[PDB]
């Protein structure tokens, strides 16, 4: 019994995957090969944001461009002002261990979550004066990864259970449950539109979800071991991956494979983040060698490298003006480089 | 200018509180208990000791959480439920995150010659073969930087703490010894 | 997509001999250290022998040690469990896996009962 539709999963699986090649004519390498390079691209540290006691294990950028969101493990989430480098506010945690933090669009709440496996939005506005947790959602059964608002009042999260669950903040029960990953899921990417999002998981898998249905559009192979940071590609119909493999790879929703992957025999150390530039011509990845590499996306070479960071860089935002960058590491530092 | 003005005094206030909250976070000693958070103190002391029963048996993402944790507290009972123990320690002990950690070793609930054929030539009886068992692994690639504490608990819980509180204090010494190039 | 397959496993006479083969793909095999974990009837995956990268370092269980022997072809992705004089107690399904991460000493979550990068595994049966 079980022996047929195991036999008849291979074969579906061989079907797809003669599909795929059916659709590879020529490779990206091929089409942008005649094209010319972007050159050097050296970024210096404009600022360095210093006041985090412990490790810095993700950030966020705003919508304003101006404001970003910190998380350490000592239990304090600090929100910073690029601009001044002064610090607007700084908020107590209840669990110290936290993994994840991310920052509204509209910039009124804040979401942050860890080894608590529970997602805490945080209201700023607070006419009172003070900002204290709004709502505090629990469900999931295994520490929370990462977390996206979409608006002020359903928010994305991937948790290490195998699946990522959309919330509903007014009530606080989850609206859709997404399952199909094997391993811990520890990355999310939110499309420009709200309606799609994709997600990596320790499987050497990435899967395209339908935030209004609630099934996985497409599944995503060719990574080698546990895929950490995912991040889409400004147009939103292809998406970046970095794994612990030391490789970045590109993808496309519409040819559904793989198209370029960004290697360097150098580098035999993981990739913890991935973000794009404005116009989506560079790729900064962030590894655990203590430094960053900027790639040409569209060449796979390589442009520069962002060095100054002693310790693991963590989390790499790019801001929605696409302005600056700002890299968090290990060190207890933020750094915007420009 | 006068909102510039207005915006040091609110990053004035939140300075004053993280010096507060630097002194408190650098006075309690970090450890990680797995076979949730609990504050206790031995001597005025503060110790912060978070257990990891509520996550999956896949520990090898969210274990790089701790490495600012002063020292992981290993329990081992005593399917061959004991090699499964010595091979989860020997993960944790040459981990690239985890290579500065030391790790007190607790033995509670006190045939081992089918499962280990090493037995029948060993004297020294039971209890110090599963101790140098795991002592073999923490020797072999410590490189000075970390060292492991084996106990011995009839599990009665009766002066537990205090054996913690000794460990912690050797760990501290031990690694201040090595940065003054004196050990 | 990562792939492991397990063949040469059946039943066998106990003092018998039986030849386990691994077939490895979609991953540079010469990188990660290669695994063997069996999952007796009414019993939890427990962990066989381990090989490094090049084949050095090998290490078994107390209960296998001096009678099974673990070997790795890097030219053909494969990985070998040579397993000689077999009793009743060995009796079990045996599975082949690979540490999560290249380059590294630590080897975890390999018998997690949900772990990804391990294969469908292949019935092994020690009876008269």
């Known amino acids: 019994e079980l022996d047929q539709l195991r036999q008849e999963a291979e074969q579906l699986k061989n079907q797809i995957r003669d599909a795929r090649k059916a659709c590879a004519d020529a490779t990206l390498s091929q089409i942008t090969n005649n094209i010319d390079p972007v050159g050097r691209i050296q970024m210096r540290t404009r600022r360095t944001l210093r006041g985090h006691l412990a490790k810095i294990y993700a950030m966020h950028w705003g919508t304003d461009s101006r404001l970003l969101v910190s998380a350490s493990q000592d239990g304090k989430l600090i929100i910073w002002d690029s601009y001044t480098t002064n610090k607007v506010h700084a908020i107590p945690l209840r669990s110290s261990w936290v993994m994840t933090c991310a920052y509204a669009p509209s910039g009124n709440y804040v979401a942050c979550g860890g080894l608590d496996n529970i997602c805490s939005i945080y209201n700023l506005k607070t006419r009172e004066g003070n900002v204290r947790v709004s709502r505090e959602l629990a469900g999931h059964t295994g520490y929370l990864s990462c977390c996206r608002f979409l608006d002020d009042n359903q928010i994305v999260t991937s948790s290490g259970d195998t699946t990522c669950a959309l919330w509903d903040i007014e009530t606080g029960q989850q609206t859709t449950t997404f399952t199909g990953h094997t391993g811990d899921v520890m990355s999310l990417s939110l499309a420009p539109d709200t309606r799609l999002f994709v997600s990596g998981a320790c499987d050497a898998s990435a899967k395209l979800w339908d935030v209004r249905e609630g099934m996985c559009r497409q599944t995503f192979t060719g990574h080698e071991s546990d895929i950490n940071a995912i991040c889409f590609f400004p147009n939103g119909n292809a998406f970046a991956t970095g794994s612990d493999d030391a490789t970045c790879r590109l993808f496309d929703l519409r040819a559904d494979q793989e198209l370029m992957t960004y290697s360097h025999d150098n580098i035999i150390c993981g990739i913890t983040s991935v973000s794009f530039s404005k116009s989506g011509r560079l790729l900064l990845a962030g590894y655990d060698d203590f430094n960053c590499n900027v790639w040409d996306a569209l060449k796979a070479d390589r442009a520069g490298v962002l060095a100054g960071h002693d310790n693991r860089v963590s989390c790499l935002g790019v801001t929605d003006d696409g302005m600056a960058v700002a890299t968090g590491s290990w060190d207890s530092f933020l750094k915007i480089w420009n | 200018r006068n909102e510039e003005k207005a915006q040091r005094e609110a990053n004035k206030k939140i300075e004053k509180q993280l010096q507060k909250d630097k002194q408190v976070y650098r006075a309690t000693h970090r450890l990680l208990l797995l076979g949730f958070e609990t504050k206790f103190q031995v001597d005025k002391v503060n110790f912060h000791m978070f257990d990891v029963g509520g996550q999956r048996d896949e520990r090898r993402k969210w274990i790089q959480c701790f490495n600012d944790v002063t020292a992981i507290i290993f329990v081992v009972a005593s399917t061959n439920r004991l090699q499964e123990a010595l091979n989860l320690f020997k993960s944790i002990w040459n981990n690239r995150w985890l290579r500065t950690i030391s790790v007190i070793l607790f033995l509670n609930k006190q045939k081992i010659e089918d499962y280990f054929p090493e037995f029948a030539r060993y004297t020294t009886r039971a209890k110090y073969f599963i101790r140098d068992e795991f002592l073999r692994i923490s020797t072999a690639s410590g490189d000075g930087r970390h060292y492991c504490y084996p106990h011995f608990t009839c599990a009665v819980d009766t002066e537990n703490i205090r054996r913690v509180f000794n460990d912690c204090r050797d760990i501290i010494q031990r690694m201040h010894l090595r940065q003054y190039e004196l050990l | 997509q990562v792939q492991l397959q397990e063949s040469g496993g059946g039943l066998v006479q106990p003092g018998g001999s039986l030849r386990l083969s691994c077939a490895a793909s979609?991953?540079?095999?010469?990188?990660?250290?290669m695994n063997w974990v069996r999952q007796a009837p009414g019993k939890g995956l427990e962990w066989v022998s381990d090989?490094?990268?090049?084949?050095?370092?090998?290490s078994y269980t107390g209960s296998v040690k001096g009678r099974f022997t673990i070997s790795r072809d890097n030219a053909k992705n494969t990985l070998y469990l040579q397993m000689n004089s077999l009793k009743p107690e060995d009796t079990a399904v045996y599975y082949c896996?690979?540490?999560?991460?290249?380059?590294?000493?630590?080897?975890?979550?390999?018998?997690?009962?949900?772990?990804?990068?391990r294969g469908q595994g292949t019935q092994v049966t020690v009876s008269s």
């Open positions: 979609g991953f540079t095999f010469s990188n990660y250290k």
């Open positions: 090989i490094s990268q090049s084949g050095a370092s090998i």
């Open positions: 896996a690979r540490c999560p991460a290249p380059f590294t000493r630590d080897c975890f979550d390999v018998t997690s009962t949900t772990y990804a990068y």
